Assembly symmetry: C2
Homo-oligomer: 386 residues x 2
């Protein structure tokens, strides 16, 4: 049903304990506060589906949402693509509009409504903070800045179709008391970011009002770009190879179908099947899987205007001899080769990602998370250099 | 004889024109100013011999030195390895002693004895400065910061043998009016850097006084570590290959000798020659050059405690078959392989560099300069994307 104790809170919400369910044992509650919760519930669900570790479970009512319990980091991370207001005042000379390409990440010391300054990434490390048991140093500070930039880009991309420019945003992290992971732990409403109208060009430039932002955010959870990956295999004995591609495609939310066809045996049939994927208007990418001399990829590519990846099921036995039938093609063939089965699915994702922000986001989160993972393995092996 | 007009000047020297010799048409003149000139004359000659582009020609008298004429950049570049004084005051929290590893580079706006603030690398670009025709932007600002760090490390290394720790330094650049290159254009005396005694440990930590620094700086121009590269070739028909290595070694100031010996023909003789390089105490690195089945490298490595590089003179005719005789050696052989002739000389340099700061410096300057070159080619091809 619902319970609750006391606990902490921020400026927009009040965090409460939740007996009858420990861990995610947290409830955020807080006119227009219901708008602020609708926004923060989408951005979170969005960033979460993309792959970003974020403190959010399910939406709750109109002005609430439960999320895992965690100790907050007293720092305000801000990311910019364009310099405006405050920044200008702090950085004399930078004319408004200056675009930052990496883009710029700055963090502000303790949120304290007093002066709450700007800390150097080095003053945070020397701060030697520790929450939920996690001592915050190089590794952790590096994760948050990287994750902030990643979260920025994801939202920046997600907004573009609504014709909105993410100028800059503010975000706070927190260590999950259970998993001990640094997570995007606190609400993101219309005062967490700044969205130009981007159809330097419009009025004096006015951030979208929480009202307009409100009735658009749910649209970021869906994409206009449809996409499909069709896997063609010359022989069912490679079914396993094709399934790794299919499963991989599943990780990037891209629908994928497996099919059996032989350029060598049923030339005519291969073209036929090609036609029914071409004629139905769904943007498609073909992945050709043919062992030995691969004539499947070459033929497909030569008869379709869509991309064609040859992903040969090589084994070290004769692999070195077979790949060349996939590389070395007669002129006029765009056909590309990718040896890794999941790798080919990833490439396909990156192809569709150019049009589907939801896919792009998953690629981006993944890039980040892989870095997070690298970072941790090094710290774990570093322990053993004593 | 000598002439001169008016021109500009800094805080320690007064730059004068020099009729009878345009371009390098500059003279720096300025008790203890003679000390300041002796110091700045070595550091310059040092950085110059290492490969750093620096505004310095020859020393002149006791309190002067001529250098090429150039327009100065109104910025003070500072590099730190350890945080102290000023920095601490500017960065609250960073306890004294904090080591910066990249290490830290900061630049201060216009030298103006007024407030002469701290500029962001982005405020300098937006400053849109232009000297001697060179508009200063991304590329140029990036060169100076990189060059500053490189110059730091070189001097940091150069000092170590005198048991001195380079804590931080200040440096100013300038565009050479002739070549148009950004060069380390202005004096480096004892007020340009800070040298601990490094034998947190000594007194309250006192920078060396210009007197002690003075009678040590000339020692940085020489090294304690002797080094020699001996090139063994199984056949004089590879003489050309060996000479590229020799010439390359010449670029890193390492003496190199070529010799003829055959593991297959004169086994006994090869060992003999090996012995006369081992017995004379000069730290040596052996580079084995043997075509076809290379038994020279393998044998050398197995009979000497010094390093042995196999640098096969491969050609695409049978290269793919020959390299394996240099790779794939029976156990107990440290023998390493390096295909590029100059590349093998470079590796040898990096080996000796671990002990000869003069060599290390040349390696470092080279790393930098290659980056400078990459940077410029991209900017030159970028022009053609209009």
């Amino acid at each position: 049903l619902n319970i609750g104790k006391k606990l902490y809170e921020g400026k927009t919400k009040e965090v409460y304990e939740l007996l009858d369910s420990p861990g995610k044992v947290l409830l955020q509650s807080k006119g227009k506060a219901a708008i602020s919760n609708k926004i923060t519930s989408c951005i979170f669900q969005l960033l979460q589906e993309a792959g970003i570790k974020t403190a959010f479970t399910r939406k709750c009512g109109e002005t609430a949402f439960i999320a895992p319990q965690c100790e907050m980091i007293p720092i305000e991370w801000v990311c910019r693509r364009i310099a405006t207001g405050s920044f200008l005042k702090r950085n004399p000379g930078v004319k408004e509009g200056y675009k930052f390409y990496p883009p710029k990440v700055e963090l502000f010391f303790k949120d304290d409504a007093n002066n709450d300054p700007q800390w150097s990434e080095e003053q945070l490390i020397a701060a030697k903070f520790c929450f939920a048991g996690l001592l915050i140093g190089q590794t952790e500070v590096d994760i948050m800045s990287h994750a902030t930039q990643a979260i920025f880009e994801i939202l920046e991309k997600s907004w573009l179709p609504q014709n909105c420019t993410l100028v800059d945003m503010k975000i706070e992290f927190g260590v999950d008391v259970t998993t001990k992971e640094i997570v995007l732990a606190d609400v993101i409403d219309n005062d967490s970011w700044r969205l130009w109208p981007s159809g330097p060009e419009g009025l004096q430039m006015v951030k979208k009002n929480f009202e307009w932002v409100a009735e658009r955010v749910e649209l970021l959870l869906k994409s206009e770009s449809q996409c499909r990956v069709v896997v063609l295999m010359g022989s069912t004995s490679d079914l396993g190879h094709c399934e790794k591609i299919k499963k991989a495609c599943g990780n990037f939310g891209i629908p994928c179908e497996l099919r059996v066809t032989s350029a060598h045996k049923g030339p005519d049939e291969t073209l036929r099947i090609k036609a029914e994927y071409e004629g139905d208007g769904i943007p498609t990418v073909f992945v050709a899987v043919a062992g030995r001399s691969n004539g499947l990829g070459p033929v497909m590519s030569g008869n379709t205007a869509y991309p064609v990846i040859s992903c040969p099921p090589l084994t070290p036995d004769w692999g070195v001899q077979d790949v060349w039938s996939s590389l070395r093609l007669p002129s006029g063939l765009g056909c590309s080769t990718v040896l890794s089965p999941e790798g080919s699915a990833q490439f396909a994702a990156q192809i569709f990602g150019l049009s589907n922000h939801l896919v792009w986001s998953k690629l981006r989160a993944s890039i980040l998370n892989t870095w997070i993972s690298l970072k941790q393995a090094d710290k774990k092996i570093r322990e053993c250099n004593l």
